[PDB]
Amino acid sequence: PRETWGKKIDFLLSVVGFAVDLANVWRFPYLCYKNGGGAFLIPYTLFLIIAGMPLFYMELALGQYNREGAATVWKICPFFKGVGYAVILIALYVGFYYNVIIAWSLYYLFSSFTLNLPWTDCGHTWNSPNCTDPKYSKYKFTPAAEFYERGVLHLHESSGIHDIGLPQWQLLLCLMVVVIVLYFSLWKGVKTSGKVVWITATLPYFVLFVLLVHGVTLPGASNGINAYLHIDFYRLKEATVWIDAATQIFFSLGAGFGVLIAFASYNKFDNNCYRDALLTSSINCITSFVSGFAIFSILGYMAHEHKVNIEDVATEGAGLVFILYPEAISTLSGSTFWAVVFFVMLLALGLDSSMGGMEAVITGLADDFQVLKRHRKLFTFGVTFSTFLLALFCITKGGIYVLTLLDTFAAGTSILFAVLMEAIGVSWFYGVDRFSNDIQQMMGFRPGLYWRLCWKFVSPAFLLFVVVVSIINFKPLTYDDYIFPPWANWVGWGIALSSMVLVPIYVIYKFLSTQGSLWERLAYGITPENEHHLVAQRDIRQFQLQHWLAI
Amino acid sequence: YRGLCCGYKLCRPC
Ligand SMILES: [Cl-]
Ligand code: NA
Ligand code: NA
Numbered sequence: 001p002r003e004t005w006g007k008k009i010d011f012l013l014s015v016v017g018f019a020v021d022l023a024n025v026w027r028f029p030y031l032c033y034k035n036g037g038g039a040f041l042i043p044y045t046l047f048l049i050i051a052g053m054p055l056f057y058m059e060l061a062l063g064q065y066n067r068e069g070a071a072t073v074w075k076i077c078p079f080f081k082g083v084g085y086a087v088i089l090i091a092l093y094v095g096f097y098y099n100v101i102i103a104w105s106l107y108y109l110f111s112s113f114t115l116n117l118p119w120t121d122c123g124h125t126w127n128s129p130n131c132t133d134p135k136y137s138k139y140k141f142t143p144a145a146e147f148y149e150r151g152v153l154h155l156h157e158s159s160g161i162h163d164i165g166l167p168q169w170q171l172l173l174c175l176m177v178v179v180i181v182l183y184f185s186l187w188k189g190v191k192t193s194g195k196v197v198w199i200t201a202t203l204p205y206f207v208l209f210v211l212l213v214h215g216v217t218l219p220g221a222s223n224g225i226n227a228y229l230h231i232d233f234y235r236l237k238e239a240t241v242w243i244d245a246a247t248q249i250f251f252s253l254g255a256g257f258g259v260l261i262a263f264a265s266y267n268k269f270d271n272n273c274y275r276d277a278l279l280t281s282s283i284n285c286i287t288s289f290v291s292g293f294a295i296f297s298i299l300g301y302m303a304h305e306h307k308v309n310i311e312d313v314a315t316e317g318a319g320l321v322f323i324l325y326p327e328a329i330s331t332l333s334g335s336t337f338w339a340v341v342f343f344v345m346l347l348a349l350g351l352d353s354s355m356g357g358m359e360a361v362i363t364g365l366a367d368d369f370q371v372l373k374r375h376r377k378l379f380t381f382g383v384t385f386s387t388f389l390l391a392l393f394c395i396t397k398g399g400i401y402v403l404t405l406l407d408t409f410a411a412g413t414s415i416l417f418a419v420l421m422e423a424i425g426v427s428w429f430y431g432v433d434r435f436s437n438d439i440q441q442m443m444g445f446r447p448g449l450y451w452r453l454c455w456k457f458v459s460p461a462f463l464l465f466v467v468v469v470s471i472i473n474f475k476p477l478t479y480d481d482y483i484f485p486p487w488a489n490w491v492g493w494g495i496a497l498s499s500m501v502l503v504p505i506y507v508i509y510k511f512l513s514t515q516g517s518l519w520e521r522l523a524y525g526i527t528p529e530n531e532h533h534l535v536a537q538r539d540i541r542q543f544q545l546q547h548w549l550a551i
Numbered sequence: 552y553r554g555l556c557c558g559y560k561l562c563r564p565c
Contacts, residue, residue, distance in 0.1 A: 022560070023560060027557070027562070031552065034552050035552065094559075098560070101560070240552070240553060244552065247557075251559060316555075316562050317560070317561060317562065318561060403561075404561070404563065407558050407559055407560055407561050408558045410559070411558070411559040412558055412559065475556055475565040478563060478564070478565060479563060480563075480564065
């Protein structure tokens with residue numbers, strides 16, 4: 001038999017935990033402030049209505065009706081099974097470098113258990129002789145900036161991607177703890193994974209409330225809030241503002257990454273997933289908007305402290321969280337209670353997203369091979385051990401150069417291409433009319449005209465607009481003032497093409513393996529596996545023009 | 552934004 005969620009609340013907290021991560025904190029408020037302030041919410045809320053929710057609703061109903069993972073859900077259109085293998089490999093690529101970012105948060109949490117924070121003075125063994133006591137965002141000779149690039153990263157001992165060196169033993173030990181925690185929270189299925197999210201999915205909300213209450217009291221906090229929610233309606237006349245909201249919506253919801261389809265496969269058949277699609281989509285977007293109030297309270301406080309403008313302090317991820325917040329924290333009364341709670345919140349943010357991505361591989365692959373389904377504990381050991389071994393490249397002395405390469409090419413054009421092909425198969429080849437008949441089979445109500453129009457015309461067109469734009473607006477690899485060698489770009493494109501080439505390859509294998517006439521091998525690959533008996537009866541739905549004209 | 556290239560989880564000055 002197939003296991004199910006112990007309680008309904010377990011499923012809701014798993015989806016919310018995977019959807020909310022560091023991207024909702026260290027990226028979104030900066031984009032809103034830079035683009036249009038309060039006018040950036042118009043294209044942001046528009047793409048959620050027409051593209052964010054239709055894809056979220058589509059994926060949740062796909063797993064519940066079929067009760068299969070990402071790879072093997074394509075029994076409805078056997079020619080598209082290569083798309084499932086593309087999202088599984090992409091989910092493996094992200095794990096090779098996302099657990100390193102979590103290791104940084106654990107390294108900062110272990111250094112906060114003292115009465116003298118390491119990032120306050122310029123008298124340690126990791127300090128350059130030019131360290132100076134405190135565009136403030138570009139200065140690299142401050143105590144907080146010298147503890148990140150010379151105390152944790154050890155970047156000053158590397159000359160580029162041509163010579164990275166041996167892994168750091170301090171960072172290696174922190175990576176070991178993360179993988180062990182990940183294994184024991186995933187080795188028993190969803191009976192154990194459904195209880196871990198009771199703490200990790202709710203802890204950041206508790207800390208964010210306390211940080212917000214104290215944040216608005218600090219001097220200069222009002223200036224940061226006022227500049228955060230300004231209105232500039234003339235910024236909507238530029239095409240870059242609309243593209244910025246289009247990429248943020250697709251990458252912050254995580255719809256089509258193979259995680260939501262696995263979660264919904266353990267749901268009950270009669271569960272109402274139309275309600276779940278709207279509720280969990282809105283919590284993710286509301287969390288991003290609320291988090292900007294707490295962040296810009298600190299930014300306004302920092303600008304008042306240094307007697308500079310708010311435009312000289314604003315930063316983005318990995319420069320605001322690890323270089324900027326520790327500097328402001330070191331002056332807030334206790335300065336130790338605040339340090340502990342801040343880095344505890346980061347751990348709770350990232351742990352849920354790593355669990356969700358790894359389950360998309362175990363559930364997807366165990367549903368393809370039956371032998372793997374019978375050994376869950378041993379198979380979970382293989383996935384985590386491979387992640388730990390292949391993540392040793394990102395904890396070396398030149399580890400940020402490798403992490404930058406993987407971040408650009410593992411996702412992006414490859415993941416945008418796979419989701420575009422998945423929507424085409426379900427909406428057009430499988431049939432929108434058939435899809436709505438399956439939803440009415442479980443819930444008892446047909447979706448409607450608005451939802452059917454967004455699945456067949458609007459969502460495929462929105463995805464195609466982001467795929468083309470991503471290719472056109474591509475630049476060679478760089479990091480700060482370091483320019484990557486030309487060969488490093490060819491290796492980057494090889495990683496991206498590895499997932500994409502899988503889709504055409506499976507079509508050739510499926511065609512060349514099945515027997516029959518030329519027009520017979522084509523019919524088997526487009527007919528659902530449970531409706532193969534009518535192929536020989538010379539009545540194929542997809543071979544009539546009436547099928548393709550459905551709206 | 553212009554002059555800042557963002558990928559999935561991190562942004563770099565391009
Ligand atoms: Cl977001
Ligand atoms: Na998360
Ligand atoms: Na998110």
